[PDB]
Amino acid sequence: MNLFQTVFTGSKQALAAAEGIVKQAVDEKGRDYKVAFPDTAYSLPVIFAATGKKITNVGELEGALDIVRSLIVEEEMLDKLLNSGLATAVAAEIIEAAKYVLSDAPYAEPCVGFISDPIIRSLGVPLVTGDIPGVAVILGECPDSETAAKIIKDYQSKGLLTCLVGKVIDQAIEGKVKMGLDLRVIPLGYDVTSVIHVVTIAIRAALIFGGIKGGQLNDILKYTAERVPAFVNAFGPLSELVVSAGAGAIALGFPVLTDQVVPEVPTLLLTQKDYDKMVKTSLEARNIKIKITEIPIPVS
C-alpha cells in the first residue's frame, strides 16, 4: 500500500477512536467536567503547543476534535503527511485525556502512564549537559523476550533513557530488566495511544527549556528536531494506526527505526533486521555520541 495512504488510514482510524471515547465522556460526565493531567501546568501539552489554548472541561475536549480533522488534508504531499501524523498525536492525547476522565486511576503499575511536570524538569537538567545521550521510544513486540531485553539493557547501559509502550513491556519484565525513573526505563501503557506521553516530554521541553510560547508550532518543531535527541524503535507487525503515529515523530524530527519491511525514507524511516546492531543504527540516525570518561591529566 502507498505510504501516504497508510498514514492517512491510521489518522482517520485515530479520529474514529477519539470520537468513540469522547462520546463516552459526554454521556458519563456531561459536557462540563474537569479534564486535566496530574501535575501539569500546560493542560493538554500537545494541543496547547499547537493552538496556545488550554482545555479544561469535556465540552472543550470534544471541541478539540476539530483540530484533528483540520490536520488531515488527504493530499500526497510531505507537509500533508507530517500534519496528518500530528493529527494522530492530537487524537492520541484526546483518547488519553478521556482515559483519565472516565477513570480516576486508569493506569495501574507496572504502567506509569502520564509523566508529571516536576519529572520533566528533574530529567531536564541532565539532558542539556548530555548526561543522558538520548531517549529511545521502543514500542511494539519483539519476536523473542531475550532479544528485547538485550536491546533495552543495551540502551540503559549507554546511559540514555528508554521508554517502553506496548507488548514489549511484558517482554521486558520477562527479560529481567529493571524499570524506574532513576533506572531510565519507563513503561507507559499497553495501548498504542500511550506513546503520546513521551511526545509531551519533548513538547514541554520546548515550552519550559526552549521558552517558546504556546501556539508557535513551527518553532516548537524546530526545537524538537534540533535539541531533544529522540528516536523510536518499532518492532513486530505494524498496524495502520501505529504507522500513522510514526509520522508524528517525523514532524518532531525523530527518525523511525523498525524491523518490519516498509517504504524507507533516509534518516527518517529505516529498516534494520539485525537486532545485534540495531542499537548502533539508532544512535547514528539521531547523531548520538557516547560521552567517554577520561581520567584528568595535570601538567604543572
Partner: protein, 629 residues
C-alpha cells in the same frame, strides 16, 4: 507585441542591437512572416524531383496524395524519420570524434586518461581485460570496441549495464533493437527515399530504432569517454549569464559542442607565455566563458563561467567585449559571420565539419591539440588589441549556480543519508526510497533548445518551477539547464524559495539544489544511466517509474532524436513546441497514443507550460498508482 525574452540582460542588449543597427534571430523570425502551413504540418515532401508536392492537412478535403502516391501520413512519417536520422548523425560524429581521441591517448601526450577507475569500469562493459595491463593499452582496446559500435556489420552491439533486460527484450519483440549507429542512420535514409517505406507505423518504428543508437550508444560513449579523458564531473561552483564578461580582461567565448577543443583551450589559458601576452596588450587576464554544450562541458569539469544559452549567442557579441569567439560544430548561427563584421570580434571556425563563409578558419590540429589551441588562443588575445572601450556595454547581471552533478557525484551525495549499518553504499537506493515512499512524487528531466516561437527561457523556467513546486525533482541539461542557471535555480537556496515540502526536505538532507545540472545534451545518457539504475534496483522496467521528460522550447533535429529515444526507452515526453506532424492523423495517433502500447510511453504536445505540469503530475500519479507506490 509579445516579449522576446524574460532575462533582463537579454532585453538590455536587444536594445543595443537595435541601436547599433544589427539584426538578431528575433529580427529574422519576424521577417519570415507567416511560415508555410504545409511544412509546419509535415505534409510537404521533396524526396525526389517529381515534386515538390504538398497534400492537404485536412483529411477528406483538398489534394490527398502526392505524385508517387504517398499519403499525408507517409510524408509526415518520412519527414519525421529524417529529423531523427539527422539528430542521430549529429551526436554520432560527436561521440565518434571523442572515441578517436581516446584511441590516440598516450602517456606523454596532450590527451591523457584522467579517470582510470571509470575507464576500468567501462572496459568491463566492453569485455576488455584490465588485470595487470598498461592503462593506455586498456584505453586503446576500449576505443576500438567503442568505435566498432558505429559501423560493425556482424554480431551484436555493446550496450551499457544500466539498461534493464526487460527493456532489451521489449525492443527485440517490437523489432527495434539497435544495430550500428551509422548503419541505422543509412537505413532510415534508405526507407525515406521515394518508393520505399509507405507505412506510418513501420516508418516511425525505424525512427525509434535509429534513435536508440544515440542515447544508449552515441551520446553514451561520447559522455563515457569524455569523463575518462577529462575527468568525471563533481560538485563545482560557477557563475552564469552574460554578466560574467570582464571589460578589463580578454574575453574568449567557447561555443559549440566538441569538448576536445574547449578542453585544450582551458589548459592553454594557463600557459605563462600566453598570460604575459594578455597583460602586455593591456588586459588583466584571460577570462574564459562558455556557451551551449561546450560551455557546459568545461563548466561541469573546470567551473568555467557560462556566458549564455542558444538564442543569446548573438547578444554576446553585441556587448562589444568578446575578443575571440571560438566555435567548432553544431548550433553556431551562420549569422554570426555577418554579425561579427560590425564589431572587432574575430569569429573563428575550427572544425572542418562546419565551415562558415566569411569566417576565420583555424583548423584544430588533433595531432597537436595543445599547440593548436595555444595558436588559436593567441589570435584571440591579440584581438583584444582592437577593442573599442567606448562601445562596450556589459550588463551587471549574473547569478551563481552549482553544477557538476554526474551520476557518480549524485551517488556520492546520496551516501550522506545512508545509515552506516543498514543499507549499502554507492547505490541509488536513497533516491529509490523517497520515490517509493512518496516524499518525491517523481523525477523530471527538463532539456531542450530555445525557439523564437516561445518567449525564450519563459517555458523552461515556468516548467521547472512548476515541477519542483509539486515535489518533483528536476534534472536539466543543455540550454534548459543554462536557463535555470541564469534565473538562479541551480542554487541550494532555491530549495526554500521554490521547492515543495518534500523536495525541500530532500534538498536539506542531501545538501543539493532542487534543480540538478547534469551537463550537456550528449550527457543526457547520464539520465538514462540514472533512471536505468533505479529501474534495475526496483526490479521493474522504466515504463513503470514515475519519470517524465520535458522539452519546453526545442528546435533542433537533435531534440527530435533525443525525445524519440526517451520515449522508446519508456519515459513519457512533453513537447512545448509542436513538431511538424499535425498534417498526419495516423502519425499523431502513433506518437501520442499507440506508442504507449508499444514501449509504455508516448509523446505529449502542450504549448502551455502550466498545463504541461498538470499533465506530468497526473501521469506520474497514474504510474505510481499502477505500481502501488
Amino acid at each position: 507585441e509579445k516579449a522576446k525574452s524574460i532575462d533582463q540582460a537579454t532585453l538590455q542588449l536587444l536594445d543595443k542591437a537595435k541601436q547599433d543597427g544589427v539584426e538578431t534571430v528575433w529580427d529574422r523570425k519576424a521577417d519570415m512572416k507567416v511560415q508555410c502551413g504545409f511544412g509546419s504540418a509535415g505534409v510537404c515532401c521533396r524526396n525526389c524531383s517529381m515534386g515538390p508536392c504538398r497534400v492537404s492537412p485536412v483529411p477528406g478535403k483538398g489534394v490527398e496524395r502526392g505524385i508517387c502516391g504517398a499519403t499525408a501520413d507517409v510524408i509526415v512519417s518520412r519527414n519525421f524519420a529524417r529529423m531523427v536520422a539527422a539528430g542521430t548523425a549529429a551526436h554520432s560524429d560527436h561521440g565518434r570524434s571523442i572515441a578517436l581521441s581516446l584511441y590516440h591517448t598516450s602517456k606523454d601526450g596532450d590527451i591523457k586518461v584522467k579517470d582510470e577507475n571509470k575507464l576500468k569500469e567501462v572496459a568491463k562493459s566492453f569485455n576488455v581485460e584490465t588485470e595487470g595491463r598498461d592503462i593506455y593499452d586498456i584505453a586503446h582496446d576500449v576505443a576500438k570496441e567503442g568505435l566498432s559500435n558505429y559501423g560493425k556489420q556482424l554480431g551484436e552491439v555493446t550496450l551499457p549495464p544500466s539498461l534493464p533486460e526487460k527493456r532489451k527484450e521489449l525492443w527485440r519483440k517490437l523489432g527495434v533493437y539497435p544495430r550500428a549507429v551509422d548503419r541505422e542512420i543509412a537505413a532510415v535514409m534508405h526507407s525515406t527515399h521515394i518508393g520505399c517505406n509507405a507505412d506510418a507505423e513501420a516508418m516511425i518504428k525505424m525512427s525509434m530504432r535509429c534513435s536508440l543508437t544515440d542515447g544508449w550508444m552515441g551520446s553514451f560513449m561520447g559522455t563515457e569517454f569524455s569523463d575518462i579523458m577529462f575527468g568525471t564531473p563533481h560538485s563545482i561552483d560557477t557563475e552564469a549569464n552574460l554578466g560574467v564578461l570582464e571589460k578589463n580582461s580578454v574575453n574568449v567565448v567557447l561555443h559549440g559542442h566538441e569538448p576536445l577543443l574547449s578542453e585544450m583551450v582551458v589548459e592553454a589559458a594557463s600557459d605563462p607565455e600566453l598570460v604575459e601576452l594578455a597583460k602586455s596588450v593591456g588586459a588583466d587576464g584571460i577570462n574564459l566563458c562558455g556557451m551551449c554544450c561546450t560551455g557546459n562541458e568545461v563548466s561541469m569539469r573546470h567551473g568555467i563561467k557560462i556566458a549564455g544559452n542558444f538564442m543569446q549567442q548573438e547578444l554576446a557579441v553585441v556587448t562589444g567585449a568578446v575578443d575571440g569567439l571560438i566555435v567548432d560544430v553544431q548550433c553556431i548561427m551562420p549569422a554570426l559571420a555577418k554579425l561579427s563584421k560590425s564589431y572587432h570580434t574575430k569569429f573563428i571556425t575550427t572544425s572542418p565539419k562546419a565551415h562558415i563563409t566569411d569566417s576565420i578558419y583555424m583548423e584544430f590540429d588533433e595531432e597537436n591539440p595543445l599547440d593548436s589551441a595555444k595558436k588559436i588562443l593567441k589570435e584571440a588575445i591579440l584581438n583584444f588589441k582592437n577593442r573599442d572601450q567606448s562601445k562596450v556595454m556589459i550588463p551587471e547581471l549574473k547569478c551563481k549556480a552549482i553544477l557538476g552533478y554526474s551520476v557518480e557525484e549524485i551517488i556520492n551525495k546520496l551516501d550522506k543519508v545512508v545509515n552506516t549499518q543498514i543499507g549499502p553504499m554507492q547505490t541509488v537506493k536513497p533516491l529509490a526510497d523517497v520515490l517509493v515512499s512518496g516524499v518525491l512524487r517523481g523525477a523530471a528531466a527538463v532539456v531542450g533548445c530555445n525557439n523564437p516561437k516561445v518567449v525564450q527561457d519563459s517555458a523552461h523556467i515556468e516548467t521547472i518551477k512548476g515541477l519542483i513546486k509539486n515535489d518533483v525533482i528536476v534534472v536539466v541539461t543543455g540550454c534548459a539547464a543554462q536557463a535555470a542557471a541564469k534565473y538562479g535555480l541551480l542554487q541550494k537556496e532555491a530549495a526554500e524559495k521554490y521547492a515543495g515540502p518534500g523536495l525541500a526536505t530532500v534538498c536539506k538532507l542531501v545538501d543539493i539544489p532542487p534543480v540538478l545540472h547534469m551537463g550537456s545534451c550528449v550527457d543526457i545518457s547520464r539520465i538514462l544511466d540514472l533512471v536505468g539504475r533505479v529501474a534495475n534496483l526496483l526490479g521493474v522496467d522504466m515504463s513503470d517509474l514515475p519519470v517524465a521528460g520535458v522539452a519546453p522550447e526545442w528546435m533542433s533535429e537533435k531534440a527530435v532524436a533525443i525525445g524519440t529515444y526517451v520515449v522508446t526507452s519508456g519515459i513519457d515526453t512533453w513537447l512545448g513546441v509542436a513538431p511538424p506532424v499535425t498534417g498526419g492523423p495516423e502519425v499523431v495517433d502513433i506518437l501520442t497514443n499507440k506508442m504507449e502500447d508499444w514501449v509504455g510511453a508516448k509523446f505529449f504536445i502542450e504549448t502551455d507550460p502550466h498545463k504541461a505540469v498538470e499533465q506530468i503530475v497526473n501521469r506520474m500519479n497514474e504510474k505510481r498508482k499502477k505500481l502501488g507506490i
